Design a protein around this ligand. Structure first.
Ligand SMILES: [Fe+3]
Ligand SMILES: [Fe+3]
Length: 673
């Protein structure tokens, strides 16, 4: 159709929208995008109209971005307003709790303090902090402003009924909803803090930088962090209540026309964005402020497709809003929801769950990235990950809690390992094959984004050839998780929709699968140093592996040589950080504790994995954990993805950034670049 039906709320917005259509029809050719204008009564009416295909697009505050996500509207964010520059565009703000340096209290000591709020019902100054504190408030919690006044010893809460809740105006008597109140709004809440009236202001991070000249000033303040520590205000990205999108174009989740919407708004900012045209302005109006888009906006960015509303708002924001909206609280550790990679893993997890005495629960997802996304948003808590996805999870905010260890040791739990080895395996009867001409040969990979399967060897290949078209360097291959039309899906063996999927419905997914792919169709397999021994000499009983001999396979060396499989130490491509379990920072304590308990009960201490449950039970498919996992090891100081993986591997993965096809990585780096 190529017509975007924008939704306006007021006669003013509908006027501006019509002007927007007219000026676009004058500069965009007939084959370009256009606008149509639908006037509805409220942001809520616009949300429904988009859901019912009566409209297409509307820009929303974060609070309505949440509501628009809920059943039955199922809208999603598709285009973002930004507010800085094209070289540093500021799509999100950060709700922060700013205090005076050295005032002697943490987040869990806020009760009986004096609080400075921007306004009653506002976002960063109320709904977010009060949302996060909701269960800390004293029952009865409705009405909210009474529970809040019984929480803080006194406040400034502009726009609140003073007569009803008089403790809420101690710092601004009467609680002026106008800016005649000196502590009204963002700058006024911060003056309430700077002035000594309150002990904490709930403001945006940018409120601090625009009310303090230099860093020496900002050093006089600190931020309250959710882990009950303080950090400097400059460290707001690592110390905030929530990340909030400033203004979000939303659309239908299927058939929403996001690409048309983006082309419409991309073309619009070129012609009519900040300082582009004297004839028309997207970001102002002679009919009123903030019509359709914010007058402060400098342009638009496309929201990465993997993003849904929960991911976009962030976990912390959703938690706070859930609490206030639902108006209901919950009453040891929570049992850990493990995310299983499809039904092959879901079965082993279920046996784990029933034998765990209630401490492990299971969720499923069809890809690793989908699982990481459930852990991010709270639908799950933990899983083990190849280092390549440890990297991505960290980019997405998750943290490693325990490592898989593979070396036999009298003290495995407490002995860091240096890593395994990424190797290129070939068939010895193919004597020609050399690391210096795989060009046009056929490749087998554990999965896109995995360390030995992909990051290491494609890292090296991208240095040699300096383009990312790996499916054209190889004639064909199997790299589960590639684009379905890729020649790196051709050698895969899954049936139907399972072909090339990065789960065990694709028999070539994983270390064993990449090796099977080599035996059966390909010329080179990128796997770990242990994989050929694990599947030869009868150790793997399946018909394809039964008769394979270790000696029939060889390792390609970096120097162009070839050694046997047992000689990986002098003939590998790189070290590979062990696989690790990841979770949210708020589940790190419980997951570290629960897993160490579980592996005492079902780890490598176990005699006869036939009689009892065995979390690391050596089957073929590395279900949940790698089949050669000896124990889960403590991480000590190496507890971010950078520290756990090490500078080495991180610059390795980083060098591949331009080639990345990970939709989840693009989504998380959009929320934190
Ligand atoms: Fe606001
Ligand atoms: Fe791996």
């Amino acid at each position: 159709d190529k017509t975007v039906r924008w939704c306006a709320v007021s006669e003013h917005e509908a006027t501006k929208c019509q002007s927007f259509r007219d000026h676009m029809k004058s500069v965009i050719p007939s084959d370009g995008p256009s606008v149509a204008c639908v006037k509805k009564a409220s942001y809520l009416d616009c949300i429904r109209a988009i859901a019912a295909n009566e409209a297409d697009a509307v820009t929303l505050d974060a609070g309505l971005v949440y509501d628009a996500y809920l059943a039955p509207n199922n809208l999603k964010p598709v285009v973002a307003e930004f507010y800085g520059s094209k070289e540093d565009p500021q799509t999100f703000y950060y709700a922060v709790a700013v205090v005076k340096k050295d005032s002697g209290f943490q987040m869990n000591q806020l009760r009986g303090k004096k609080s400075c709020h921007t306004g009653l019902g506002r976002s960063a100054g109320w709904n977010i902090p009060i949302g996060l504190l909701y269960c800390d408030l004293p029952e009865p919690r409705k009405p909210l402003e009474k529970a809040v006044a019984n929480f803080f010893s006194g406040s400034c809460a502009p726009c609140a009924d003073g007569t009803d809740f008089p403790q809420l105006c101690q710092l601004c008597p009467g609680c002026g909803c106008s800016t005649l109140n000196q502590y009204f709004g963002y700058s006024g809440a911060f003056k309430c803090l700077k002035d000594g009236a309150g002990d904490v202001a709930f403001v945006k991070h940018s409120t601090i930088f625009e009310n303090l000249a230099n860093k020496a000033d900002r050093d006089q303040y600190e931020l309250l962090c959710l882990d009950n520590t303080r950090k400097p205000v400059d460290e707001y990205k690592d110390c905030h209540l929530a990340q909030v999108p400033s203004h979000t174009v939303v659309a239908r989740s299927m058939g929403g026309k996001e690409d048309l919407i983006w082309e419409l708004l991309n073309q619009a900012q070129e012609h009519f964005g900040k300082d582009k045209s004297k004839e028309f302005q997207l970001f102002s109006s002679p009919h009123g402020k903030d019509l359709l888009f914010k007058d402060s906006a400098h342009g638009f960015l496309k929201v990465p497709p993997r993003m849904d509303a929960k991911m976009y708002l962030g976990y912390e924001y959703v938690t706070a809003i859930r609490n206030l909206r639902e108006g209901t609280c919950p009453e040891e550790c929570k049992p850990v929801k493990w995310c299983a990679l499809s039904h092959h893993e879901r079965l082993k997890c279920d046996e784990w769950s029933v034998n765990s005495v209630g401490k492990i629960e299971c969720v499923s997802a069809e890809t690793t990235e989908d699982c990481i996304a459930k852990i991010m948003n709270g639908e799950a808590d933990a899983m083990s990950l190849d280092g390549g996805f440890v990297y991505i999870a960290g980019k997405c905010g998750l943290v490693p809690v325990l490592a898989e260890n593979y070396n036999k040791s009298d003290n495995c739990e407490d002995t860091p390992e240096a890593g395994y080895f990424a190797i290129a395996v070939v068939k010895k009867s193919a004597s020609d094959l050399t690391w210096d001409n795989l060009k046009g040969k056929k490749s087998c990979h554990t999965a896109v984004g995995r360390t030995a399967g992909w990051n290491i060897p494609m890292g090296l290949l991208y240095n040699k050839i300096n383009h990312c078209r790996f499916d054209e360097f190889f004639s064909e291959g199997c790299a589960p998780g590639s684009k379905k039309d890729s020649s790196l899906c051709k050698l895969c063996m899954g049936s139907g929709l399972n072909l090339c999927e990065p789960n065990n419905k694709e028999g070539y997914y994983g270390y064993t699968g990449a090796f099977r792919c080599l035996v059966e169709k390909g010329d080179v397999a990128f796997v770990k140093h242990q994989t050929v021994p694990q599947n030869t000499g009868g150790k793997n009983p399946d018909p394809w592996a039964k008769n394979l001999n270790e000696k029939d396979y060889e390792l390609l060396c970096l120097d162009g040589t070839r050694k046997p499989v047992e000689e990986y130490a002098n003939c590998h491509l790189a070290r590979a950080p062990n696989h690790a379990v990841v979770t949210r920072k708020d589940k790190e304590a419980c997951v570290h504790k629960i897993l160490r308990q579980q592996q005492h009960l079902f780890g490598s201490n176990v005699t006869d994995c036939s009689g009892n449950f065995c979390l690391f039970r050596s089957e073929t498919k590395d279900l949940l954990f790698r089949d050669d996992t000896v124990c889960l090891a403590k991480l000590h100081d190496r507890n971010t993805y950078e520290k756990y993986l090490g500078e080495e591997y991180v610059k390795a993965v980083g060098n591949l950034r331009k080639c990345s096809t990970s939709s989840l990585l693009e989504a998380c780096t959009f929320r934190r670049p």
